[PDB]
């Protein structure tokens, strides 16, 4: 059924399963070759020397196009998908490329390859909002300073292991083409081993938009136009459920959304479902599935609110307390007859009919109001029952409208 | 409203203004006519009486 | 399409189509002829005069059996089929013949088509119950009196349309064999003209299994074997669906069954089908289908009940009432948000999130309970605002936690 839940239905660590993100969307982008139609010369190494062949670019002619869908097709290890920019451009400029998300997510795979040689400088950003703040995450280049103003691969501090760190690894050439980038942002970090108790980790997870810029690029000739480019991208993640659903569904507004189990809501099952706020969200952990948990009141009210001085009091139980409690019920739980009525001690503690008015005698019981536990009327002298109407052992009824019931002398 | 239906506001923003007769040399004015991108924005409507209707 | 709806799709009556009823079905008798192996003789009349001829009857002789199919079966009037009892019987004698339907009709015409003479007095039985109860309709006989202790040829009683006559009427021989019966039980009512209103008559037809015993029969002469025979039996008919169901269909049991159309219930479309609890059922008739209606919870149950009153006292309009009337929505129509609750104005009225609750300030708001008309939460002091967050003119907000907006002089 639900990996959700265990082999009685336990309640367990459900999770989207790891898949490329950034498979099959669009992009837009800064700038690409061929508007106007541009051309391009490509340089092969054979043996020890060089060797110039030259081409063009029309996007209008499909097979010299080199659409963002070249970014994200399926990358055919053999019918590569290179986009190319426009020429003419390096430091200090931003080459800026644009991404629409919508779910949160943490992230373990970032993979890459080239079309152009590896440049030099480079950066990485994100963004935890939708399109409007934006975060680095590392950098790289060689001069980390005079470009970035940055350690070349400084250490993960355990204080701070949100570390942005800049490193000339990889910003090398050869490769030339097809280069790969290895990034794991779980490295250097020394709590990276329990990920479940990292909340900065939790953190450095967290993101919801991202942005790239370029400044610098190799230089080799040393008349020819300089360019960028790429055959395709992959990225594998996760989609954010905090443990609390198994996969991702779209909304009614075609919205992919966690379906958050474990009684959870939001997009990322980042907040409970309504009515379930006893103890707080929390995340699903191997040990405990840190479920929502909702207010009870005995089957008569739908609203609840909490106190955390009730839970921490509670020598962490419970602080759940109801609100709107109907059915002439009353308290945290709805769980007691208001006054007028009493409690139907027979029946269940939970039932809709549990409390019943306080009929008491107009004579033979003197309050309005009856016993709310028991319903004892106010019963006189020799009078009993539970609103007070007969009379006892030894008790005659007489047609006196106050006194019906005397004793025997 | 009436107009129940097809009601007829034109708004002309020359009406009232004293120096509109030489809007040709108001730049305040000239400026006040600049515009790029526009917003309309409603939160009130009238009653009557008094979900029978849904009124929309 | 389907003549439950107009061209216009208006939902109008739909009726089966009237069919020979006793078409190939199979009937138990009293006795029949061949077991063991019976004889029977035949005379014929010369002109003026008469001729014998004489037969017998073996069951286990295909040809000279006579199986009661050859009442059902598709009968040629020049290659009849001829069901033939054991012989040297004569009343007084039950000579009862059977059949069960299994569903209630409607029966327009029954006629005979004799292999024997016409006898004097026989009589009619009906069962309005599945072959537990029997009621007569009409007799025929000479003697109704010294028979049937009736009197022939009575009158049909305008104040007792249910009358069970008796007539010497056409009991002659001539016809001694293929005997004529066209009876029509409309012919002498008043009130035949119209039956869609003759409910009396709509019971006077109401009949679900039949009976029919025989007695007294003429001898001529006057060494006899005397007996009767029969060549087919048609009688007209169609399904008894009230007008709800243009048809009846088998069931998945195999039992033939109203396709009740008209939102009706029962294998005869007699009741509402299950939360058509609005109004009561009723049947359709040439003005209006007098339909079943389901009750009213705008989305908000799957059962519901009814009361009369609540349609007699509207005035005759409606009587739905829900059954756990869901979805935060109370009422008859599940049609009003309970205790606690208010209208969520922006939805329509059969949204399931059409009520709204009382989100009210715990702190600036008294309560939680705002009027469920407007959705004014309960603002303590001077103190206004919709949730009763914000301070007023002449309120500046403290960090008491009890009493934010005080006034200013
Ligand atoms: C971007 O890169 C692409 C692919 O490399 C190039 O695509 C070219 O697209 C044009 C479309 O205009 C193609 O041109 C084709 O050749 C014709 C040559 O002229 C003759 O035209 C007609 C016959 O078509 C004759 O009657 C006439 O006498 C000429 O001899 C063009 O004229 C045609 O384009 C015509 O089509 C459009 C509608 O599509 C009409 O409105 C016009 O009448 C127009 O003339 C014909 O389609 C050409 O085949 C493509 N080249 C390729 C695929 O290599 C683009 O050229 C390039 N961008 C630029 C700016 O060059
Ligand atoms: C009711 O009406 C039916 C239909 O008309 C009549 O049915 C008769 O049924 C019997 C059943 O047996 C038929 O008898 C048949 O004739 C045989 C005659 O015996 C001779 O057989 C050959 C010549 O045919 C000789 O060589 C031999 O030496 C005998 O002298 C019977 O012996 C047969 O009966 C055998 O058949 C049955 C299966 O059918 C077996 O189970 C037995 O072993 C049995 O011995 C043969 O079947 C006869 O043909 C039918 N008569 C008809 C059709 O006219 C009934 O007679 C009738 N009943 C009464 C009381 O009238
Ligand atoms: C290059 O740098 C950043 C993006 O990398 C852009 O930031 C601009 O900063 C100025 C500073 O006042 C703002 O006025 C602009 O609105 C910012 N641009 C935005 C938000 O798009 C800068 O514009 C970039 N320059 C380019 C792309 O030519
Ligand atoms: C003739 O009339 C009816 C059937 O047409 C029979 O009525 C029987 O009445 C007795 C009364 O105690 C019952 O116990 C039997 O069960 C009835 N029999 C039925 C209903 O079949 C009556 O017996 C018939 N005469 C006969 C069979 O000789
Ligand atoms: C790769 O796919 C494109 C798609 O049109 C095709 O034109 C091209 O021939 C393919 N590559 C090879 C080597 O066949
Ligand atoms: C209700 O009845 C019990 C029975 O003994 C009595 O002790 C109590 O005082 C009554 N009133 C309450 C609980 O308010
Ligand atoms: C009448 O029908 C029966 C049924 O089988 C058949 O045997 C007989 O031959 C038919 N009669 C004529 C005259 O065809
Ligand atoms: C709720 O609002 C209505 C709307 O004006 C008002 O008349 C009423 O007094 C308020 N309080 C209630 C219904 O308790």
Chains 1, 3 share one sequence.
Not at chain 1, 368 to 373: A, F, L
Not at chain 1, 379 to 386: E, P
Request: aromatic residues 10%.
């Amino acid at each position: 059924p639900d990996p959700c839940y265990d082999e009685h239905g336990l309640p367990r660590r459900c999770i989207p399963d790891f898949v490329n993100s950034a498979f099959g969307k669009e992009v837009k982008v800064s700038s690409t070759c061929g508007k106007p139609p541009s051309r391009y010369c490509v340089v092969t190494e054979k043996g020890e020397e060089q060797v110039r062949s030259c081409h063009l670019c029309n996007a209008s002619d499909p097979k010299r196009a080199h659409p963002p869908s070249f970014l994200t097709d399926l990358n055919n290890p053999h019918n590569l998908t290179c986009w190319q920019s426009d020429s003419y451009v390096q430091y200090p400029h931003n080459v800026t490329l644009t991404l629409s998300l919508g779910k949160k997510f943490e992230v373990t795979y970032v993979s890459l390859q080239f079309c152009s040689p590896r440049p030099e400088s480079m950066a990485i950003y994100k963004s935890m909002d939708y399109g409007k703040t934006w975060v680095p995450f590392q950098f790289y280049s060689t001069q980390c300073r005079k470009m970035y103003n940055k350690p070349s691969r400084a250490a993960i501090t355990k204080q701070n292991e949100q570390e942005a760190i800049c490193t000339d690894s990889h910003t090398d050439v050869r490769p030339l083409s097809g280069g790969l980038i290895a990034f794991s942002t779980l490295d250097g970090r020394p709590t990276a081993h329990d990920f479940d108790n990292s909340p900065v980790l939790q953190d450095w997870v967290t993101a919801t938009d991202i942005k790239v810029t370029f400044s610098r690029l190799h230089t080799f000739g040393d008349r020819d136009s300089y360019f960028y480019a790429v055959s395709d991208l992959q990225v594998g993640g996760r989609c954010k459920c905090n443990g609390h659903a198994s996969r991702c569904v779209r909304d009614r507004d075609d919205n992919l959304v966690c379906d958050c189990k474990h009684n959870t809501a939001g997009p990322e099952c980042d907040r409970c479902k309504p009515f379930h706020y006893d103890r707080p969200w929390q995340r699903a952990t191997a040990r405990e599935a840190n479920e929502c948990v909702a207010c009870n009141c005995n089957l008569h009210a739908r609203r609840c609110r909490f106190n955390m001085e009730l839970y921490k009091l509670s020598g962490r139980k419970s602080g759940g307390v109801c609100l709107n409690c109907r059915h002439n019920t009353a308290g945290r739980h709805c769980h007691y007859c208001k006054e007028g009525f009493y409690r139907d001690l027979s029946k269940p503690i939970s039932h809709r009919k549990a409390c019943k008015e306080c009929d008491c005698h107009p004579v033979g019981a003197a309050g309005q109001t009856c016993n709310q536990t028991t319903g004892q009327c106010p019963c006189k002298d020799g009078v009993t029952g539970i609103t007070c109407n007969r009379c006892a052992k030894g008790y005659q009824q007489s047609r006196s409208p106050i006194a019906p019931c005397i004793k025997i002398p | 409203v009436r107009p129940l239906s097809g009601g007829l506001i034109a708004f002309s923003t020359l009406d009232g203004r004293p120096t509109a007769h030489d809007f040709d040399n108001s730049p305040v004015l000239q400026d006040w006519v600049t515009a790029t991108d526009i917003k309309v924005t409603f939160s009130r409507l009238h009653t009557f009486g008094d979900a029978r209707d849904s009124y929309f």
